[PDB]
Write a protein that binds this ligand. Structure first.
Ligand SMILES: NC(=O)C1=CN([C@@H]2O[C@H](COP(=O)(O)OP(=O)(O)OC[C@H]3O[C@@H](n4cnc5c(N)ncnc54)[C@H](OP(=O)(O)O)[C@@H]3O)[C@@H](O)[C@H]2O)C=CC1
Ligand SMILES: CC(C)N(O)C(=O)C(=O)O
Ligand SMILES: CC(C)N(O)C(=O)C(=O)O
Ligand SMILES: [Cl-]
Ligand SMILES: [Cl-]
Ligand SMILES: [Mg+2]
Ligand SMILES: [Mg+2]
Ligand SMILES: [Mg+2]
Ligand SMILES: [Mg+2]
Lengths: 513, 510
């Protein structure tokens, strides 16, 4: 129900106890690559469909791991007719010269495992043609449970003669690739992933899923279901990971500058603080270490911010979660995908830019003269708002029924080890826009909601002398999630992602020199 | 909806070459009410929020003028705090005009379901079970059909189902009616629909109800066309969009060096005063023509940059309403007002305690009587561009001009804006329905962000003026259509002040 066990004939399963909850996990490592041929029995060609954020990263890691394993499995990229991604696929090493790049439908037809890494809205509007091209008894692998939610809305399901699995990286595509490359110097590195076995028609599903995750470089892989994954994931990206952190940062920058703080300092006290010291401390030492590093006066400011921000944050998170679970949000994303093209006598509306406004122009200037190795200030009030929202997200997921491994990755680990480093590197777009179409739409839709509720409720409470809810503070300090976060931290490799503004491993349209 | 009345006169209006049928109002038609209300001895008004207090009083007053013996009875839940309010308005248990909700539904010939839309969604089976065979269920919004559709359901087959939907807030329906008493009437235009009609009394019962409310003109629609345009419009130009624009522009103007006093005047006062007055009786073209040539250039830059980003959000909002996503969101939000699943209750909070609104209180404290605010060209350009973008979305999605003009133009300037001019954004937004209040809160931030990110950035980057867009605004057929509708407007302007006593109990001040 909240935790899910499984069996592997190839890999070693191990137990972790999180807040008294035993959960089974599979640790990663380059030393395990020799086990891939066994995990992939019956597979001659893996067809990677798409070339967005996850496909470029997954395809190269898979190819690199199989090469290290001395495997004969072919990794072939399949693209749609009108794609402009063929050149980038070749630059990454996939080409017609060696039969590793071709048409999307032809690629699906010849594949034993099909990794459907195209936009979620595109999967929603083209699944019938994907099913018609699958080999009977082959395996469809997803990296997000969105398609199940859409089928449920139509009262439909997957074919009956196909296995259906998922390996879902809890981090952005560029980080899955970058950490894997950095891991070549040691025993591997990467992004934690969840896996699911929705349908199994021959008994190979679990090992194929586990092999795929290990080949991606996942430090640890945990079990979930397609439904638990889409509910926590669509929600999480709109929450602490992208939407809420963006709204917090806009709201606080505006407050601080209105109050007399210079623009330079307001940017340092919001974005640099969150993406630097707050993230670094939470990554290796946890939220309690962060709070304990504040001065006595700093603790009072943290308390005022946390106390005022906790419930208004929960209000929006609660709303968002329910919209994801009900089907409302999934339908919204499918319809948004169609509006990217002209129809009904109306114009096309592709997504626009989110970093050309005041605080981001300020950010460019702060970064223009920022020395290398800067960790930012630990501004107490900013830490209070951020940690209050992170704790509110954990509570919502807890009350809605998710496992601790899922809760911790979706609300803590992903923010600090995968996402925040990109915002420290080059601002909000470098973080948000390197994520999926579903996540990019979600961030734009929900960031404004967090901004408004924090300004209208939380900040007004602070300015009207509201009493500090010390029970909330005490609850934070005694919360069982902190011990579980420490247990998960022990499975983290000792390689921190390296990213700068001029990174060439991000989406093509985001490259800058 | 081609209708036919046997009691009332139908008249044709031509809007941009499209003939539409309308029923004009007036207190002179009140004597026809007994005829219209064939088979009605009691009208059960269920609820006491924003629409019920206004409708119940307007109906009672009109029936008294018609010398009618029809009883108007208020139905409320258990130990509702509204009982005292209803009594203050003259409805009481002693004369049988105030009673229990279920008991009132059971004995009524026309049941006006004026409770929150989410409560209708979660309690319709109980309402249906209390309806007498061949009685009439009246709604003032098509939301319930939308919800039933999501469940693959419909209304009972032994009942008539109609709607009379005021295109304006509850307090304005009452206030304008009161102001129209000595001039043959005034009120808020309404749309009407007949979803189910058991015996042929449905059309005249709906038409009578509308005329009794004081509607200057009543136009025909369907329950589905009404919910699609209505849930969308309140999130658009009517509440959500105007709020986002005003927050967005206040921030820009003050960032550019404008004092807070002038930034509030150049945004809120400007839109809710002079802009609304001009559009109300002269139109959008007239507003543009009233600008100096430099003003016209500023208007053009704002309009050219704001039109498409505004349409982007409007297009998204409309499709979420038509698909069912938004209706479901509202039903679930209603449940979160109470504790469940071990989580806290989250009632709606306040939206007017932030910076620009505290500034507004100060601006109003020294505002002279009759002050209509400044006419700031850039502000007019942003506002008018969103108004035109909303008209185009409804046009492309298939709505009638009567429906488009009321939901995108008339309601904003004649019903809503006067309340924001009188006491800020909450006095306007929070006097509307639970559905509209949630909508305004969810969508205002969207308009604020897209305008700051795309439209204003384009202006700062020196984007060329889209000449075709400007040319099309100038020749748009909606302008003449708006002129025709204005001819049907009584020469009465709603009178509202900060201390209005006809607003929701919790919004009344001294
Ligand atoms: N981005 C991330 O880091 C995360 C994403 N995921 C999941 O991974 C999956 C892929 O996401 P992501 O990489 O972000 O991709 P995007 O959401 O960025 O989708 C863009 C890709 O989809 C393709 N596409 C769009 N429309 C069509 C169509 N009609 N037919 C065929 N292909 C189409 C594009 O093709 P083309 O190249 O030709 O233009 C491009 O390859 C999703 O399920 C997502 O939820 C999981 C974890 C994290
Ligand atoms: C924040 C982001 C990388 N995330 O994990 C996603 O699920 C996404 O891009 O859809
Ligand atoms: C803006 C408002 C008064 N409107 O007409 C509505 O439909 C409502 O309150 O639901
Ligand atoms: Cl690389
Ligand atoms: Cl009154
Ligand atoms: Mg995710
Ligand atoms: Mg996602
Ligand atoms: Mg309305
Ligand atoms: Mg409404």
């Amino acid at each position: 129900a909240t935790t899910f066990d499984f069996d592997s004939s190839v890999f070693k399963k191990e137990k972790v106890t999180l807040s008294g909850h035993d959960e089974y996990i599979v640790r990663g490592g380059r030393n395990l690559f020799p086990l891939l041929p066994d995990a992939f029995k019956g597979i001659k060609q893996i067809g990677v469909i798409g070339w967005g954020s996850q496909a470029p990263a997954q395809a190269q890691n898979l190819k690199d791991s199989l090469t290290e394993a001395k495997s004969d499995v072919v990794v072939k990229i399949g693209l749609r007719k009108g794609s402009n991604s063929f050149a980038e696929a070749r630059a990454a090493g996939f080409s017609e010269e060696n039969g590793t790049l071709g048409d999307m439908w032809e690629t699906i037809s010849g594949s034993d495992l099909v990794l459907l890494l195209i936009s979620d809205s595109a999967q929603a509007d083209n699944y019938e043609k994907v099913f018609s091209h699958m080999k009977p008894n082959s395996i469809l692998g997803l990296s997000h449970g969105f398609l199940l939610g859409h089928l449920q809305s139509l009262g439909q399901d997957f074919p009956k003669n196909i296995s259906v699995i998922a390996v879902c990286p809890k981090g952005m595509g560029p980080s899955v690739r970058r950490l894997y490359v950095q891991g070549k110097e040691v025993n591997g590195a990467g992004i934690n992933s969840s896996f699911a076995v929705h349908q199994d028609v021959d008994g190979r599903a679990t090992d194929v899923a586990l092999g795929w995750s290990i080949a991606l470089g996942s430090p640890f892989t945990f079990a979930t279901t397609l439904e638990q994954e889409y509910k926590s994931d669509i929600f999480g990206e709109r929450g602490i990971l992208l939407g809420a952190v963006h709204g917090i940062v806009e709201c606080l920058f505006r407050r601080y500058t209105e109050s007399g703080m210079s623009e330079d300092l307001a940017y340092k006290n919001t974005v640099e603080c969150i993406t630097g010291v707050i993230s670094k401390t939470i990554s290796t030492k946890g939220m309690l270490a962060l709070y304990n590093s504040l001065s006595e006066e700093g603790k009072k400011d943290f308390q005022a911010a946390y106390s005022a921000s906790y419930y208004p944050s929960m209000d929006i998170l609660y709303e968002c979660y329910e919209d994801v679970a009900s089907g409302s949000e999934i339908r919204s994303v499918v319809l948004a995908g169609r509006r990217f093209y002209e129809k009904e006598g109306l114009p096309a509306f592709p997504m626009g830019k989110i970093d050309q406004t005041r605080m981001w122009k300020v950010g460019e200037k702060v970064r223009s003269v920022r020395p290398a190795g800067d960790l930012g200030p630990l501004y107490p009030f900013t830490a209070g708002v951020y940690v209050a929202l992170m704790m509110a997200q954990i509570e919502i997921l807890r009350k809605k029924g998710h496992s601790y491994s899922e809760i911790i990755n979706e609300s803590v680990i992903e923010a600090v080890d995968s996402l925040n480093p990109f915002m420290h590197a080059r601002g909000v777009s470098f973080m948000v826009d390197n994520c999926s179409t579903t996540a990019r739409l979600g961030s734009r839709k929900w960031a404004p909601r967090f901004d408004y509720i924090l300004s209208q409720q939380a900040l007004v409470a602070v300015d009207n002398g509201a009493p500090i809810n010390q029970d909330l503070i005490s609850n934070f300090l005694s919360d069982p999630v902190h011990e579980a976060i420490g247990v998960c931290a022990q499975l983290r490799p000792s390689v921190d992602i390296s990213v700068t503004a001029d990174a060439d491993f991000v989406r093509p349209e985001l490259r800058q020199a």
